[PDB]
Structure 1
Amino acid sequence: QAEIKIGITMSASGPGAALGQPQSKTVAALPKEIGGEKVTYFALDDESDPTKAAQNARKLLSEEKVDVLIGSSLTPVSLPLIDIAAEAKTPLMTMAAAAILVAPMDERRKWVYKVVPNDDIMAEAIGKYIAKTGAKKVGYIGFSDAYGEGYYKVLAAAAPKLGFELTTHEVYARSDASVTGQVLKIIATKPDAVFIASAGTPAVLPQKALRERGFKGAIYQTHGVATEEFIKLGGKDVEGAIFAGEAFSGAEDMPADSPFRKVKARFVDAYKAANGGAAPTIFGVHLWDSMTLVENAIPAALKAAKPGTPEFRAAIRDQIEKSKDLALNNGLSNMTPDNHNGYDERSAFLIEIRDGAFRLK
């Protein structure tokens, strides 16, 4: 009989690498037995490319007949996987951020779960903070994709009532070498602050370009930057950046017995043991937390059916939907039939880069 099989596609190369590489390194830390059954992981790089991710998913689903699919790392790469997983009646744990991946619910997103808090929650929280600082004019640059646009649309809708105006809607593609034209346009609007909607190492470019061209005001980013690689590459230019993000990023500033510190230690300890003592970045935890949900669902699913059958996959899908009051590294998660993300505003923590580390603001 087939053991439990988990397929993973992640953006281990391409402009998503700072997200997918940590995920690739987390695979070796994942549990090799659950509910008394062996678990085998099949991990594939999708190169930050939606076409390759779809190919990976179809191979994992049709050839390996995986019980659960996990991925991808990025929103554009993950979007096509929704239909593929639903058609295959296989749960998909996406590791990307945009709300559209699971919300609003529909007959396909019934098959999809999402541990990273929906970007609209984060956008609302950062918008409120920006308003509180007294900023009245806020520049904007973000990725020309559904991740970036999810930030722009929520900020733009909230701006009027918050009491500031978005002075631009500049965009760039993740691999672009330059954003000089966009940054010059932003600077010409003489804003009080600038918002950047980006992720991974590409997020450094617009912030450095703004600083190099004389912008001295506040710069806000997103939880796409919550990797120490961003701090290292960005240096003094990213000092002081603020974003709305996850408990994981603020955990060192929470009480010692906080559940968030406990769930972080479990991940960090396992990751270090599998990776020669190297500390993980947050993006690996999106794989880890996804597997927490899957692991929690498997024992009940095993009472219903054997691994490798549609009935087992359906039981996993049914069970994750019932998960309640669960502290993940990503926040306090409560799944429902209509909410396959599981978070509210209590999941949004304001993070600041201070002295080269992520801190609670």
Structure 2
Amino acid sequence: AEIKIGITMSASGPGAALGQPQSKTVAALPKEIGGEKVTYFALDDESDPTKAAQNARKLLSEEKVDVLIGSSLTPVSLPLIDIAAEAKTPLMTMAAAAILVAPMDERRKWVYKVVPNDDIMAEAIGKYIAKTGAKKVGYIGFSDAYGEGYYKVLAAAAPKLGFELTTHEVYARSDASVTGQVLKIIATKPDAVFIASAGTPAVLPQKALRERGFKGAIYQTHGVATEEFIKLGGKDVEGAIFAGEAFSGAEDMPADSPFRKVKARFVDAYKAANGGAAPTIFGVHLWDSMTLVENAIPAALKAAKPGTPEFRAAIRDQIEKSKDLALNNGLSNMTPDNHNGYDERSAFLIEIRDGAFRLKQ
């Protein structure tokens, strides 16, 4: 039969600013790959791990999809690892935490990940923060594996880089207030504050810090790299800096940059499918995942027919061989033990300047 791709995304819930762009990207994906028809099955998981697991089981057991893609967020994606592995179906996760694919194990052998691992980003932003002369850095982040991935790496790096983390405050994504946490951070009198958050929930702690009088540097993560964050945040997020993807800095690169080229492809296709509307970065996590899948399909078709475990296993084998590939997410080199594919060369420092994401250095 035709090739079938299943996708679960957080199109509603606190992940909406990530999942909605992904949902709108589906219509831009190719109807034929390697001379074979392709059908997409996309489901909203509502930013809920239980619903994502239900979606995956439905796509795997009922549609027998050849590849599963999702989810948008780390906590939502975690349970999909075991589900995809048990089904011997490759999973292209669209979330960010390193734990989604590293260290390698017998289940993560089935998982690939186009967003650069957060530990790479945390090391990069930590080095930058140190170079500014900051010695005391406050911290607030999500009380989940995404936030904690930033905290643990920054906390380990701190003494080696010459600063100290003054707090370890957390919040849940939908929380109405972080006032208690922010007051605690402010009371430590830090030079700067790090926020580990994603989507529109990332605005709250930054606005709260500014409203409570904090005037120092505020650092965020690539979870904020959507123009929706700039729009909601306004003057309060001006000057935010984070380590992120080539996509976000593409306009401040040479004309022949491969990153401009791969971005143009995506933007043009997205606009054509969405009435001329421009995408935010999160849609590109679906797009780049499909780049890996599309590249693997011709060899897989030589091995087996779609809808068979052999075809899925062939896709898994082929993606692992991907080398020297410019994605919107960076320069990707897969290996048997690294299903992310990036090193520090793909960590770009991005700043919000005059209401736009800009390549900072």
TM-score bucket (shorter structure)? over 0.9
Report SS of the residue matched to 1:139: strand
CA drift of 1:343 comes to 0.1
CA drift of 1:38 comes to 0.4
CA drift of 1:96 comes to 0.1
Counting matched residue pairs gives 360
CA drift of 1:333 comes to 0.1
Report SS of the residue matched to 1:272: helix
Q: List per-residue Cα deviations over 1:76-116 (Å, max 9, x = no partner).
A: 00000000000000000000000000000000000000000
CA drift of 1:151 comes to 0.1
Query: Which residue number corresponds to residue 346 of structure 2?
Result: 347
CA drift of 1:132 comes to 0.1
Q: List per-residue Cα deviations over 1:266-313 (Å, max 9, x = no partner).
A: 000000000000000000000000000000000000000000000000
Q: List per-residue Cα deviations over 1:137-185 (Å, max 9, x = no partner).
A: 0000000000000000000000001000000000000000000000000
Query: Which residue number corresponds to residue 225 of structure 1?
Result: 224
Q: List per-residue Cα deviations over 1:203-241 (Å, max 9, x = no partner).
A: 000000000000000000000000000000000000000
RMSD: 0.2
Report SS of the residue matched to 2:349: strand
Q: 1: distance between equivalents of 2:188 and 2:231?
A: 30
Q: List per-residue Cα deviations over 1:308-343 (Å, max 9, x = no partner).
A: 000000000000000000000000000000000000
Unaligned stretches of 5+ in structure 2? Answer: none
CA drift of 1:55 comes to 0.1
TM-score, structure 2 as length reference: 1.00
Q: 2: distance between equivalents of 1:244 and 1:46?
A: 27
Q: 1: distance between equivalents of 2:193 and 2:138?
A: 4
CA drift of 1:119 comes to 0.0
Q: What percentage of aligned pairs have identical amino acids?
A: 100
Q: 1: distance between equivalents of 2:30 and 2:255?
A: 26
CA drift of 1:200 comes to 0.1
Report SS of the residue matched to 1:66: coil
CA drift of 1:14 comes to 0.1
Report SS of the residue matched to 1:240: coil
Query: Which residue number corresponds to residue 327 of structure 1?
Result: 326
Q: 1: distance between equivalents of 2:41 and 2:188?
A: 49
1:15 aligns with 2:11: no
Q: 2: distance between equivalents of 1:32 and 1:341?
A: 26
1:194 aligns with 2:193: yes
CA drift of 1:262 comes to 0.1
CA drift of 1:192 comes to 0.2
Report SS of the residue matched to 1:257: coil
Unaligned stretches of 5+ in structure 1? Answer: none
TM-score, structure 1 as length reference: 1.00
Q: 1: distance between equivalents of 2:257 and 2:17?
A: 28
CA drift of 1:346 comes to 0.3
